[PDB]
Structure formats: structure tokens, C-alpha cells
Design a protein around this ligand. Sequence first.
Ligand code: NDP
Ligand code: 18H
Ligand code: CL
Ligand code: CL
Ligand code: CL
Length: 225
Amino acid sequence: KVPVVGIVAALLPEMGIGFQGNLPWRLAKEMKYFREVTTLTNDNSKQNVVIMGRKTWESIPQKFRPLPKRINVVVSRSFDGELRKVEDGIYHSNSLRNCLTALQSSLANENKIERIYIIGGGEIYRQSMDLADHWLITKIMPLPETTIPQMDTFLQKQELEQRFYDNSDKLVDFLPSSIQLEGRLTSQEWNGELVKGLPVQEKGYQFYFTLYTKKLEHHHHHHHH
Ligand SMILES: NC(=O)C1=CN([C@@H]2O[C@H](COP(=O)(O)OP(=O)(O)OC[C@H]3O[C@@H](n4cnc5c(N)ncnc54)[C@H](OP(=O)(O)O)[C@@H]3O)[C@@H](O)[C@H]2O)C=CC1
Ligand SMILES: COc1cc(-c2ccccc2)ccc1[C@@H](C)C#Cc1c(C)nc(N)nc1N
Ligand SMILES: [Cl-]
Ligand SMILES: [Cl-]
Ligand SMILES: [Cl-]
């Protein structure tokens, strides 16, 4: 019942997302978007979940984790069970898939989770293409005189474009109501590809907030008893 949304910032055209265990850039306006989207809810009695891999957890500055006002879930194969409270605001899971099933139980969550955000990293995102209902992707482009940063971790763009379509026309309506964005919806060609979303510029980069949604599926089978 709860939507599952991957959220990621990726550098075009390869969709690079990391280098040596960290982000390849430091963009406050992008972090602000990430913070506001994952924190805010339409219903004030609910919170969102943020699920992340162990390495991504380790990348967040210690003074800023667990991420405030969101239920944090860290997944590691060395953890105990599918969903265990380990500290205030922190759950541990040994399974991305089982943790999502556990988080979907209305008995366990009392319908007080609005959305489940998958917040990284590379290995987690690879496993999330068949799990997410949507992707919020910030598409980042170095401006003309900007050096392309070195990167060693990438979003699976092939799998994304196979399963999802660019639904950025509906981004504004998809985001929590109280969020405010500066830019207006724009379509721009960049190194061949069509980039559509809400634009921002910061330091040496231009970036677009985009929304990807699952493509329509044929009706092949519905389980009957
Ligand atoms: N640009 C962006 O938007 C974002 C980028 N990133 C970047 O990604 C990089 C980190 O990504 P990556 O190295 O792939 O690491 P991840 O953050 O994906 O963590 C991988 C770890 O998660 C655990 N894990 C993976 N799959 C499962 C599963 N199915 N069940 C249980 N545990 C699982 C394992 O932990 P263990 O080894 O303990 O078993 C594994 O080593 C960094 O550079 C980071 O900055 C991260 C978030 C956002
Ligand atoms: C080092 O990486 C972080 C630092 C911080 C953080 C928070 C407060 C102060 C400094 C860093 C928050 C989240 C992250 C990670 C988990 C992220 C992210 C993320 C970002 C930043 N943007 C988008 N669009 N999607 C995402 N998943
Ligand atoms: Cl945050
Ligand atoms: Cl799993
Ligand atoms: Cl697995």
C-alpha cells in the first residue's frame, strides 16, 4: 500500500553517483531537495522511511545520522533479522526485500508510513529496479567549463529506461505539498538525450529534478485460488 521510491542524484550521461565511498560533488541545493522530499509528508501524523545500504550509512557525517524525522533502516548481510530496532530512529535489516515486506504490514506500521524512500547506494539501487514504484532522479550536468568528476559507482540506466518512463510532467504534483521549487518545468537536449525537469544551478553544475514512473504492464496472469 505504501509507495516505494528510489531517490538518487546522478551525473549525466553515465549516471555516476559515487566515488571512493562518497558523493562526487557537494551541492547544498541538491541536499536541501533530498532532505525536504524525504522528510516532508502530506499527512502530518506520518513519517517516511529511508532505507540504505551499510556503506551509504557509513558515508553520512556522524553528527547528521540517523537522518532526523525519518525512520532510518540500514541493511547489511551481517545483521540479525528482517527488521530489528537497534536504537532510537534506527532499524537494522539483513534483507532489502524482506525489510520492504515487513515495512508494508499495516499491522506493524499502523498505516503511519507515508512513503518508503530507497536512498542508496549503488548495490542497493541495482537491487531496487524491480522494487521501486517510482524514481526521483536529480540529473546533474557539468556546465561547459566544469571538469567531469571521477566516479566509480553508477545507476543502471539501461534497467531504468527498460522499466520506467520519464514522468517529470507530474513531478510537482508527486512531491509533498509544502515543498517549493525555484525552477519551472523545462526540456533541454544535452549530449543527445532529452532532459526534462525542474532546473537548478549550483557551483559548476546544472541539475534537473526528474520523476520516473513504471511503464504500463500487460495483463499476463493474475493469481487465483
Ligand atoms: N548520488 C547519490 O544520490 C547517492 C550516492 N551514493 C553513493 O554510493 C556509494 C555507496 O554504494 P555501494 O558501495 O554500492 O554501497 P551500498 O550503500 O549499496 O551498501 C552496500 C552494502 O549493503 C549491504 N547490502 C547490499 N544488498 C543487500 C541486501 N539485499 N540485503 C542486506 N544487505 C545488503 C551489504 O552490506 P554488508 O557488506 O555489511 O553485508 C553491502 O556491502 C558511495 O559512493 C555513496 O556516496 C549513496 C547514496 C546516494
Ligand atoms: C554522504 O551522503 C549523504 C549525506 C547526508 C548529509 C546530511 C546532513 C549533513 C551532511 C550530509 C545526507 C544523505 C546522504 C546520502 C544518504 C544521500 C543522498 C541523496 C542525495 C544527496 N540526493 C538525492 N537526490 N538522493 C539521495 N539519495
Ligand atoms: Cl537529510
Ligand atoms: Cl534481499
Ligand atoms: Cl541477494
